[PDB]
């Protein structure tokens, strides 16, 4: 149910743990395309939402 680009849905992440191993090491479809973040240290540094 991926909405169209004219109107999408916002996904707000509550209090939980961010694990990005399933994104990088598991199913590496295409480029990581990190904007400003350490791909090895994605989880070692964390944000609010």
């Amino acid at each position, epitope marked *: 149910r991926f909405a169209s680009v004219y109107a999408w849905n916002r996904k707000r992440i509550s209090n*939980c743990v961010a694990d990005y191993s399933v994104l990088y090491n598991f199913a590496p479809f295409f480029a990581f395309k990190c904007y400003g973040v350490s791909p090895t240290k994605l989880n070692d540094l964390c944000f609010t939402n």
Partner: antibody, heavy 123, light 108 residues
Framework: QVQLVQSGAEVKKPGASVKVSCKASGYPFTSYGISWVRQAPGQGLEWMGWISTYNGNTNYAQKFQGRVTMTTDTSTTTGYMELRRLRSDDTAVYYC????????????????????WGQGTLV | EIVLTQSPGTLSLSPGERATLSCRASQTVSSTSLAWYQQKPGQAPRLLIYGASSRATGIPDRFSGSGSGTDFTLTISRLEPEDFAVYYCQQHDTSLTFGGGTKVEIKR
């Protein structure tokens, strides 16, 4: 690694409520909901139960809408049914499963299937 | 709801040969609305394919998927004699419906 354990066989008279439990372990009990299916010999399965873990969103089947009520507990990560409106010839097996089709937080249309099943109980 | 038109009534063929499982939809389903499962006598169902053709539980050389658009098909090559598993196919667009069931006998 994942362990789904369940109680033994039970027989419940008609008109009562059968309590069925399934303890889940071995997987993080926050990223997946708890689904519940029924099976009888000579036929496939159904879509009778689903309750999430983060929230209590209800997505039961319309065929038995308002007939199934159940709880999920994070203390032991156990699913409990207090199934009512019991019938004599509903001695069909009930299976707990990990929902990888319904979103456990928002309710997305997750591509995939119920990759895991419990050991089963007899009612 | 939308049910899947299934007619693998009885795949009474010798193990190790080509096996075809039909899961034609009713009118129209998305290509990524598929799920194939196996069940054995005296054994709980196990998942086989969670998507179009990706492997979910092992699948060394037997289970494969083909099709395009709406129609899709399951293919088995070099079937292991012991399994004789009853196959189920489930969609994703309209709620969740299972297959009727495919019975396979000994074929001595």
């Amino acid at each position: 690694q994942v362990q789904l354990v369940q109680s033994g066989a039970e027989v419940k008279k008609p008109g009562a409520s059968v309590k069925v439990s399934c303890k889940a372990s071995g997987y993080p009990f926050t990223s997946y909901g708890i689904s519940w299916v029924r099976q009888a010999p000579g036929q496939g399965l159904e879509w009778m139960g689903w309750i999430s873990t983060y929230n209590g969103n209800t997505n039961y089947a319309q065929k038995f809408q308002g007939r199934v009520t159940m709880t999920t507990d994070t203390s032991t990560t156990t699913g409990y049914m207090e199934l009512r409106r019991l019938r004599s010839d509903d001695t069909a097996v009930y299976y707990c499963a990990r929902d990888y089709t319904r979103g456990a937080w928002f309710g997305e249309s997750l591509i995939g299937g119920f990759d895991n099943w419990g050991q089963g109980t007899l009612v | 709801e939308i049910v899947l038109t299934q007619s693998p009534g009885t795949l009474s063929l010798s193990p190790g040969e080509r096996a075809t499982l039909s899961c034609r939809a009713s009118q129209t389903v998305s290509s990524t609305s598929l799920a194939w499962y196996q069940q054995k006598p005296g054994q709980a169902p196990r998942l086989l394919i969670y998507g179009a053709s990706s492997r979910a539980t092992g699948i060394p050389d037997r289970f494969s998927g083909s099709g395009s658009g709406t129609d899709f098909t399951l293919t088995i090559s070099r079937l292991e004699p012991e399994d004789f598993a009853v196959y189920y196919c489930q969609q994703h667009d309209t709620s969740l419906t299972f297959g009727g069931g495919t019975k396979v006998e000994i074929k001595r």
